[PDB]
Amino acid sequence: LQAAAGMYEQLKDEWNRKSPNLSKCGEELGRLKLVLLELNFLPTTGTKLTKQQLILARDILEIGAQWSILCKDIPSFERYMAQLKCYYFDYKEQLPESAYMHQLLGLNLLFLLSQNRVAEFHTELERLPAKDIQTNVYIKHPVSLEQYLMEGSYNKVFLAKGNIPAESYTFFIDILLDTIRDEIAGCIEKAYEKILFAEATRILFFSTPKKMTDYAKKRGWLLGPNNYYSFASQQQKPEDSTIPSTELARQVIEYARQLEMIV
Amino acid sequence: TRPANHRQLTFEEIAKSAKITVNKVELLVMKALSVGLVRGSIDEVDKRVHMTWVQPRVLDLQQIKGMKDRLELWCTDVKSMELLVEHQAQDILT
Amino acid sequence: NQVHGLKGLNSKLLDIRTYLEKVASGKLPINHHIIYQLQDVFNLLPDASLQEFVKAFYLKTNDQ
Known part of the structure; x- marks a missing residue:
């Protein structure tokens, strides 16, 4: 039941640039729970008869989810998305579907990569196979981005895109940039013995040389354009035939005794 | 002094002392x-x-x-190990 | 036999050990034999090394 506006569809009209006030939006979240009690009444009491009402219910909570991550409210985006999760495949089908469900799916998928919750992305994909549930324009962008991470194809990764739609997609991509940056520092630490400043700016995706100086010393790298971490450790690992060891095949002492119990 | 704990020692000190x-x-x-x-x-x-x-x-x-002090460390080691050997293959041991 | 060996070894080491305390203070004689034995342990430095395993056991029960 959405009719009129002061807490019903008030949030919806706010999300537009008609009234582009965010200042009202902070207050709105407490009031929206009051209209939300009523909205909750319709799903799995009636189904089709209640259809119109569902559409409207979902639109306010979903459109406000996008508008309360331009207020940068983290707890709000997740609890709306969570609420609407069941609305995606509600019962048989309550049909609360909105255009905005299309963007939402895409926002959640970028959110999960920034948080580094790859397991959840995969779990969502298994629900997803018939991707004609809202089609692929905003869902195609997260899947390409996940592959690129996956591959090691860091150059391709979008840190240049997703800042360009400014509705709610920007919030996830800014944090993600820190995460990929860290990921490069680790790969390079084990991989290669030196790093230059000509080298560094591009690979870590630093903006400045000052950022380079900061990130390298923490790890312990910095000595100049020439350092030596990697090389020495890579060489050291084969041969423990002249040097005592017990590593692999477990703890030996247990190992011999266990082997004999089994047979 | 030095051999016992670790095996090798330099020969350069011994020649000069000679x-x-x-x-x-x-x-x-x-x-x-x-x-x-x-x-x-x-x-x-x-x-x-x-x-x-x-x-x-x-x-x-x-x-x-x-x-003496070395010997006591060895004694500990025997006891520590002995509990583990009995733990696995206890069914077989009886 | 292995477990029997550990409790047994442990007894031998106590004899030496209690003796040293007694020689150092309480003035029981210093014999070359006791000292020779102790020194060798440090010197030999045994190094753990590979080998001695087999996987045959399963095939035989399967056949039967």
Whole structure:
């Protein structure tokens, strides 16, 4: 039941640039729970008869989810998305579907990569196979981005895109940039013995040389354009035939005794 | 002193203390390996002496103290290990 | 036999150990034999090394 506006569809009209006030939006979240009690009444009491009402219910909570991550409210985006999760495949089908469900799916998928919750992305994909549930324009962008991470194809990764739609997609991509940056520092630490400043700016995706100086010393790298971490450790690992060891095949002492119990 | 804990020692300190040349200190040291007064090798690829075994000089009070504290550490080790061997293959052991 | 060996070894080491305490203070004689034995342990430095395993056991029960 959405009719009129002061807490019903008030949030919806706010999300537009008609009234582009965010200042009202902070207050709105407490009031929206009051209209939300009523909205909750319709799903799995009636189904089709209640259809119109569902559409409207979902639109306010979903459109406000996008508008309360331009207020940068983290707890709000997740609890709306969570609420609407069941609305995606509600019962048989309550049909609360909105255009905005299309963007939402895409926002959640970028959110999960920034948080580094790859397991959840995969779990969502298994629900997803018939991707004609809202089609692929905003869902195609997260899947390409996940592959690129996956591959090691860091150059391709979008840190240049997703800042360009400014509705709610920007919030996830800014944090993600820190995460990929860290990921490069680790790969390079084990991989290669030196790093230059000509080298560094591009690979870590630093903006400045000052950022380079900061990130390298923490790890312990910095000595100049020439350092030596990697090389020495890579060489050291084969041969423990002249040097005592017990590593692999477990703890030996247990190992011999266990082997004999089994047979 | 140094051999016991870790096997190898440099040969350069011993020649200078001798105050006699390098080509004649080796000679006496080889003779010492031969009789069995000391056992081990002289490696001139790095100019160090690797001692396998050292003689313990006899009737020294200090040495008795030294072996005692070591011995207690070994005793612990036996007990620690013994509980583990019985834990697995206990069904088989009875 | 292995477990029997550990409790047994442990007894031998106590004899030496209690003796040293007694020689150092209480003035029991210093014999070359006791000292020779102790020194060798440090010197030999045994190094753990590979080998001795087999996988045959399963095939035989399967056949039967």
